[PDB]
Design a protein around this nucleic acid. Sequence first.
DNA 1: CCTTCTGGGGAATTTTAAACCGGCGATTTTGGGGAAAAAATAATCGGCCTTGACAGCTGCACAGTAAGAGAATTATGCAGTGCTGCCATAACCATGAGTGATAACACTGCGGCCAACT
Length: 62
Amino acid sequence: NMKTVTDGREQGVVKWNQRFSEFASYYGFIPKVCRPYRAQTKGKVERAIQYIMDHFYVGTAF
DNA sequence: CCTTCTGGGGAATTTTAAACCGGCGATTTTGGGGAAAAAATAATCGGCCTTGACAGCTGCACAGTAAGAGAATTATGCAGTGCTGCCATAACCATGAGTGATAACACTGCGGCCAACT
């Protein structure tokens, strides 16, 4: 639930940001939002974040 | 009435069984050397089992003590100036010794001149 993709739960239903909704309709992909304060529903990407931040960005210097 | 037979006992002798001690023949044991095998120890390999973390981030508040940073104040050491006295150095002359110089020959460095290529 990022404000760059939504604008709050209008009584349970989600209100999509108009510009982002236009962007999604342009590329055709349907957006979805998991839920407030529940990151389990997107465990794949969070675990990938753990993977990258404990494998790549641990000692690499730039 | 007498003679002969037999039996018991003490002494001498012989044989066989048992036990010890020694000698002789055999196996065992100890030591050293060489080879082979087993096991022990360490290191390296693969893989299974299980769980932590990834989910915005951490800066601030209070407690006490100590340190330190900045500014004002104070102490002290350097410097400056005047007057007098003492020590150093410098100036001259003489004599000895060292080095810079001068002559001569030989080798090398630099400038003037000639030629070859583009």
